[PDB]
Structures are given as C-alpha cells and as structure tokens.
Amino acid sequence: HMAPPTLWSRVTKFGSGWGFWVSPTVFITTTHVVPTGVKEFFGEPLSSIAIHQAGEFTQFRFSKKMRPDLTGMVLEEGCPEGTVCSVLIKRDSGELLPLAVRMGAIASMRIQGRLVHGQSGMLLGTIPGDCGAPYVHKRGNDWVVCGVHAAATKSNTVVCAVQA
Ligand SMILES: [Cl-]
Ligand SMILES: [Cl-]
Question: I need a surface site. Which of 87, 102, 123, 141 has the fewest CB within 10 A?
Fold first, then answer.
C-alpha cells in the first residue's frame, strides 16, 4: 500500500530525529531523539502537554489543536507478527524513503544499554538521524501507526519502539 502525501505530512523533523502527528493533538516520537531540558514543544509550554514516555516510546498530547488539518488515526501497540509495515523515512535533504519491513516479535529489549519496548522487523537502510520515523500499515480504509523507529543492526533487522 502506497503512503499518500497527507500521511507523509505527519512526519515532522524533531530533535535529533523525527516524530509523527497521530491526530491534531497527539504527537509520537522515539525518546532518545527528544530535546532534554526544554520548557516548550512547538511553542506550547510543558504545562499544557500531557507527556508519557516509556521503553523509548514518547507520546505528547497537546491541549490545543496543533495540526487541525489532520484526521485522527489509529495508534496500536505494534502489529501482528508477519505484518509488512512501511517505515516513512524522511531525510534532511527532503527525500522520501519508505522502507518495507516484515515485522517480527514484540519484546522488551536492551539495546546499547537502553530499555526498548519494541518490535523487530526485517527490511525487505536506516541511518542515524532516522529515529522517530513511523511504522505504518493499512488495514481496510485506515492507516494504522504502530511504532517509531529506534534501532537497527549493523548488518538487516530494524526495531521500532511501541506504546505500552
Ligand atoms: Cl510532507
Ligand atoms: Cl492487523
């Protein structure tokens, strides 16, 4: 299934990587790309944002509609093993590099000392800078997002962080 422009428009440069607008108020990203010590995100004070971070998965819920042009999509905790997702990688150049990935198992893993609650997959390459890119798949009418890019083997195996 081919990701349409509006879906790409959700993928947003953020910190040392990317994040993704799940809806007008909900933004997801990979914890380690998130800027630390700041007092606002997208011009909104922390106080106005509900933040939950665990297992390298970060979710922001804003009090205000930040992307009022968007519809809300389904966010799931990973996907069924065997599902082929697309990782919607934007590069700093502007290039779009959707990568097809056959997903494997969900697991709590230690990767370079960090606890990642995630899902591994095999590419059917990712680089530093790509973390936070969304893993998506289409089910019926609806695109589903089920993780954010977190790691890859040197090899090729990729891992996305998934929500509790
Ligand atoms: Cl775009
Ligand atoms: Cl499914």
Answer: 141
